[PDB]
Design a protein around this ligand. Structure first.
Ligand SMILES: CC/C=C(\Oc1cccc(C(=O)O)c1O)C(=O)O
Length: 420
């Protein structure tokens, strides 16, 4: 592993996104860029790919596709395949669909054939960009030369963004909210997050849009990818799960959005956060060593209220079982989870795919970092879209919930750089 000192006056997010744009374009390869605690890890090129679908698990390496049938928990099937990738490389990267978390609640039968659950790959090369340095892992002569070419040219200036209209309601979000409210009033469930897609009528430049949005967002994690026909970027507002090599499991649920003093005193925000903390604690307990489950920094301010649920991974459990136990996040699903998830199948455009799922980074040492996929842009086929939702409770009003989606979309809407 060779290192290059980081040039002065260069933001690591800008350089990592530029390396993903220029280097990957020149060699015409798939990639995933993941931002995790000041490190921007560019996973470049697909050495091997694990595709977990509702009805099949495939492992693709050098054009050879191996197909397997699988039963039981999807986390066990994904874990087994991902552990094999990690015998060859130090790290693996990918995304996990919202649909991966439905099996736990007895909803596997509702999934159509070929429904994607997860896409995890081992990269050919890794470029780690931080404020201090640029670290190269398994970088061939072509990659080294292309990186050197980038450092010499410097970073491109970000063009002005192109606006998008979010005022239409073609999916009938308002009507769908009204149905959810009626179901809550009838005591079917307490909460459900419903969403709407917003079509972007022009092609966007993903690395340039990523750079622009990143200068106006402070996320828990962020990502930029081009993998298997999918382009995506996002500013993850929540950590679903983080598993360390030592076995420490962390989950950080968030709630609500000087005074400041209002958020800490709001009864409606305190109850929802406490219910979620209790839910996360009950789930982490199923995979944790007895008595290791604890809430650190309960209901502390982070423009939002949040808590850190910590535990120690039981020897009879694993990282995927920890991910599966916490999936999907309460933030993007519902309370109770089982009824909330089922309501999403009926009242939301399904399959959700990447939206409200997770973007993951795994390590050979047993590490796992899973960021909740929200505040993300997607491009699949000739379709470019944004997706945002809102938590629906008994008191919820359809027109108010629609305005809330507009606010959540405003994290991306002013920062869309058109493809030139
Ligand atoms: C930190 C997370 C808290 C919230 O974020 C969200 C929750 C649910 C859905 C979304 C979305 O973009 O669809 C979202 O951004 C909030 O807005 O209250």
């Amino acid at each position: 592993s060779s290192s290059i000192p980081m040039p002065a006056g260069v933001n690591p997010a800008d350089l990592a996104a530029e390396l993903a744009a220029v280097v990957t374009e020149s060699v015409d390869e798939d990639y995933l860029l993941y931002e995790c605690d000041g490190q921007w890890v560019l996973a470049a090129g697909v050495q091997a790919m694990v595709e977990l679908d509702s009805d099949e698990l495939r492992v693709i390496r050098d054009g050879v596709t191996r197909r397997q049938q699988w039963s039981g928990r999807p986390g066990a099937a994904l874990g087994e395949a991902v552990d094999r990738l990690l015998l060859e490389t130090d790290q693996a990267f990918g995304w996990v669909a919202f649909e991966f978390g439905v099996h736990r609640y007895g909803l596997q039968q509702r999934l159509a054939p070929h429904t994607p659950l997860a896409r995890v790959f081992s990269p050919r090369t890794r470029i780690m960009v931080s404020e201090k340095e640029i670290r190269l892992f398994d970088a061939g002569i072509r990659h080294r030369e292309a990186i050197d070419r980038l450092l010499a040219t410097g970073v491109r200036e970000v063009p002005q963004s192109r606006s998008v209209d979010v005022s239409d309601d073609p999916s009938g979000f308002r009507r769908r909210v009204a149905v959810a409210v009626d179901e809550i009033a009838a005591g079917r469930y307490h909460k459900v997050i419903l969403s709407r897609c917003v079509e972007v009528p022009f092609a966007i430049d993903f690395p340039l849009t990523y750079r622009l949005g990143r200068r106006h967002n402070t996320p828990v994690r962020s990502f930029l990818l081009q993998l298997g026909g999918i382009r995506a970027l996002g500013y993850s507002p929540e950590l679903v799960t983080a598993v360390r090599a030592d076995g420490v499991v962390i989950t950080e649920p968030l709630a609500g959005t000087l005074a400041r003093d209002d958020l800490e005193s709001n009864s409606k925000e305190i109850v929802e956060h406490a219910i979620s903390v209790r839910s996360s604690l009950e789930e982490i307990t199923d995979i944790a060593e007895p008595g290791s489950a604890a809430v650190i920094d309960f209901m502390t301010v982070r423009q939002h209220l949040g808590s850190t649920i910590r535990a120690r991974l039981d020897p009879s459990s694993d990282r995927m079982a920890a991910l599966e136990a916490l999936f999907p996040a309460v933030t993007a699903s519902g309370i109770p989870k089982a009824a909330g998830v089922e309501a999403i199948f009926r009242l939301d455009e399904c399959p959700r795919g990447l939206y409200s799922g997770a973007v993951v980074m795994l390590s050979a040492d047993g590490g796992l970092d899973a960021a909740l996929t929200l505040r993300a842009a997607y491009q699949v086929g000739g379709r470019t879209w944004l997706r945002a939702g809102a938590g629906i409770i008994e008191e919820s009003e359809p027109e108010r919930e629609f305005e809330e989606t507009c606010e959540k979309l405003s994290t991306l809407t002013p920062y869309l750089v058109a493809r030139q």
